[PDB]
Amino acid sequence: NQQSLAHSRLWDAVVGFLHVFAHMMMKLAQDSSQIELLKELLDLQKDMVVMLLSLLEGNVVNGMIARQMVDMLVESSSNVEMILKFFDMFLKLKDIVGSEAFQDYVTDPRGLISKKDFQKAMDSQKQFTGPEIQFLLSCSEADENEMIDCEEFANRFQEPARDIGFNVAVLLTNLSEHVPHDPRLRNFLELAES
């Protein structure tokens, strides 16, 4: 069955899915009203990745199936990079918000922070680019008073992103250990250090 599937059209299908996912979450993350949809999308992604792992059972070093998988990933490098950035941004934001330095800028007794203060703190930390900070501001659910609840903002995307990211990391580690001496997989690993 593995040999039959490896020579079919399946690879093409996977590529198409990787195009949609990378574009969908970025669109869905900007509005809270669609949150219940976004979770479902993430639950789909895991179900794909597991199947990919099922294709690597009993795989020897430098097997042909792993090389085909690496070629398929190289073909959709752009969407893969977008997904990795999507995970890394929130993983870093969760730790940055809880930093003591960031707690200096919040001064309202209710604990909310202004958008200008948020941008000032983000620029002061100097870890994100301008467009990234603008994307965080767009995803922020600021009210009519430009007031941002950082405590709710940080914890919005924890559990589902965790569940998908663990499998993504497992897949990357397996591919790295079973196909050494490939620079493209090395670049993909470098993009996913966090």
Swiss-Prot record:
Locations listed in the record: Sarcoplasmic reticulum membrane
| Record's comment on post-translational modification | Channel activity is modulated by phosphorylation. Activated by reversible S-nitrosylation. Repeated very high-level exercise increases S-nitrosylation.
Q: Which residues form the EF-hand domain?
A: 100-128
Q: Which top-level group of life is the source organism from?
A: Eukaryota
Q: What is known of its domains?
A: The calcium release channel activity resides in the C-terminal region while the remaining part of the protein constitutes the 'foot' structure spanning the junctional gap between the sarcoplasmic reticulum (SR) and the T-tubule. Pore opening is mediated via the cytoplasmic calcium-binding domains that mediate a small rotation of the channel-forming transmembrane regions that then leads to channel opening.
Give the multimer and partner information. Homotetramer. Can also form heterotetramers with RYR2. Identified in a complex composed of RYR1, PDE4D, PKA, FKBP1A and protein phosphatase 1 (PP1). Repeated very high-level exercise decreases interaction with PDE4D and protein phosphatase 1 (PP1). Interacts with CALM; CALM with bound calcium inhibits the RYR1 channel activity. Interacts with S100A1. Interacts with FKBP1A; this stabilizes the closed conformation of the channel. Interacts with CACNA1S; interaction with CACNA1S is important for activation of the RYR1 channel. Interacts with CACNB1.
UniProt function note: Cytosolic calcium-activated calcium channel that mediates the release of Ca(2+) from the sarcoplasmic reticulum into the cytosol and thereby plays a key role in triggering muscle contraction following depolarization of T-tubules. Repeated very high-level exercise increases the open probability of the channel and leads to Ca(2+) leaking into the cytoplasm. Can also mediate the release of Ca(2+) from intracellular stores in neurons, and may thereby promote prolonged Ca(2+) signaling in the brain. Required for normal embryonic development of muscle fibers and skeletal muscle.
**What family, per the record?**
Belongs to the ryanodine receptor (TC 1.A.3.1) family. RYR1 subfamily.
| Record's protein name | Ryanodine receptor 1
Q: Which organism is it from?
A: Sus scrofa (Pig)
